[PDB]
Design a protein around this ligand. Structure first.
Ligand SMILES: CCCCCCCCCCCCCCCC(=O)O
Ligand SMILES: CCCCCCCCCCCCCCCC(=O)O
Ligand SMILES: [Fe+3]
Ligand SMILES: [Fe+3]
Ligand SMILES: [Fe+3]
Ligand SMILES: [Fe+3]
Lengths: 285, 285
């Protein structure tokens, strides 16, 4: 429906708003372009590998590529809901959030193209637990906001997207990439991309913390809802992590070749740490 | 609802898609930051003016500030509709479109703040015709896409937003700013912003041409709909232009002071030219 008026005609941007400040930082720190990354060495690395070694890296890339695409599509309802609420500074920031995720989709798709696996269907490495999070729960929670923008709905959406998908899974994925391939000296272009992604992710997670905390600040009983929604998704998080771990343990040729002692118990504890850490960044009071 | 799968897992980005190419150009040409513009001379210019001269520049700024804010909010339904249709490259491009409009909102709001009119309510310079376009028709046409993404609905939305608001009014506004203030040597910061806006606008209009043409290409009877929707809005376009012209003719102190022979008949013909020119960029066949 209609606009009743416009904030930048009646007044100005709220220059001191936390999300205006986050928007300003995003513009300053968000200049990187996936089209500038040199993937030539990645191509050679991947070709050098045996078929067994080649397969090793793909489950993780499969999880990220679909994840970036899901979040690019599924952030749009949040931008709409906050826009309808007149939260202009949040919307300005969210334009940087969405543009970041677009570059993340682009970065992984360029890597796949470059190393010669674009024609390969990597959906085979999404198990039921992954599908429950990314094919179902994420888009359910975000799309709800089109018809229900209650504090309850907004907390559930920020929890699944910013605190679980980004703050638990994506963060653990970046850590895993560096623990495995940065050590091996493999895929320098991909690891350059991962570093830029991990920098962007910082702002995405901070938006989710801001959003969940400002709702909790109104009524501390929303804190219990946050914790509950975090716990509801945990079985699928660890169920996916456990599935990737088993794939990893079954095809170890890459680790042998490159002298990597991949401690899967250390990666598993990192996921658990991330999850608990995100819980602690929200204050009940 | 759920994702059935993901294009960048099954395959890759369509690298040859026109909107992927437009997205790539947006990243290359879209680096400018309103926070870097030096408005110090603008502040001094505005303070130097008499109250009568001060008032001269504000109707145009009022029209732009509200316009940028409306389009920042009202592009979100188009991104959603194309996302739901699986048009991934269009969505990637649209993240740059939305982020551009956010910077446009920011740029005018920084100028208002800097010259000392942020506290002034400029809604007084929106007449009924302006309100019909920006407070009503624009958001009606875009929001429709949430429940009706038929070719008819998508053509009406691209027509009002890209071909009328951007391709006719915004373009004519940029031309007007340069005809008046660039001549006077006034407001260098604002005119630097206008140049960056006008560069961005090129891509926005090209998205609308692409969108309307790909629908017309399917069925040439959609051409008649395009023309009809262009004509429906014309009375409000010229009605706003005529209102600004009369304000201009009533307070001429700025033009006298700075030796500007502001040909309002030339600006009016420029609007008419723009409108007819946009019609001609769509081919029936
Ligand atoms: C065995 C170690 C487990 C590591 C967990 C790997 C997680 C891979 C899936 C990542 C999903 C990516 C979500 C992207 C979110 C975003 O782009 O903001
Ligand atoms: C007297 C000369 C008439 C000139 C017409 C001035 C138009 C001013 C209003 C501009 C609306 C701005 C719309 C912004 C669109 C966008 O930012 O993409
Ligand atoms: Fe991402
Ligand atoms: Fe993210
Ligand atoms: Fe604009
Ligand atoms: Fe525009």
């Amino acid at each position: 429906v209609h606009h009743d008026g416009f904030q930048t005609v009646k007044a100005t941007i709220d220059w001191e708003h936390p999300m205006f400040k986050l928007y300003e930082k995003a513009k300053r720190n968000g200049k990187w372009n996936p089209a500038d990354i040199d993937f030539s060495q990645d191509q050679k690395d991947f070709a050098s590998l045996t078929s067994e070694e080649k397969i090793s890296a793909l489950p993780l890339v499969a999880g990220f590529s679909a994840g970036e695409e899901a979040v690019t599509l599924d952030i749009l309802p949040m931008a709409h809901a906050l826009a309808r609420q007149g939260r202009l500074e949040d919307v300005l920031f969210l334009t940087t959030f969405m543009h970041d995720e677009a570059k993340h989709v682009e970065m992984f798709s360029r890597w796949q193209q470059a190393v010669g696996i674009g024609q390969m269907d990597l959906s085979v490495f999404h198990n039921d637990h992954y599908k429950r999070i990314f094919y179902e729960a994420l888009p359910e929670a975000m799309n709800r906001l089109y018809a229900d923008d209650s504090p309850e709905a907004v907390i559930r959406a920020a929890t699944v997207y910013n605190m679980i998908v980004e703050g638990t899974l994506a963060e653990s994925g970046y850590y895993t990439f560096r623990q495995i391939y940065k050590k091996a000296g493999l895929f320098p272009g991909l690891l350059q991309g991962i570093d830029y992604l991990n920098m962007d992710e910082g702002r995405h997670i901070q938006f989710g913390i801001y959003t969940i905390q400002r709702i909790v600040n109104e009524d501390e009983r929303y804190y219990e809802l946050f914790i509950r929604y975090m716990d509801e998704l945990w079985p699928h998080v660890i169920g996916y992590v456990d599935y990737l771990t088993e794939l990893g343990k079954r095809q170890q040729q890459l680790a042998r070749t490159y002298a990597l002692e991949i401690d899967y118990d250390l990666l598993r504890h990192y996921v658990i740490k991330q999850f608990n850490l995100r819980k602690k960044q929200i204050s009940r009071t």
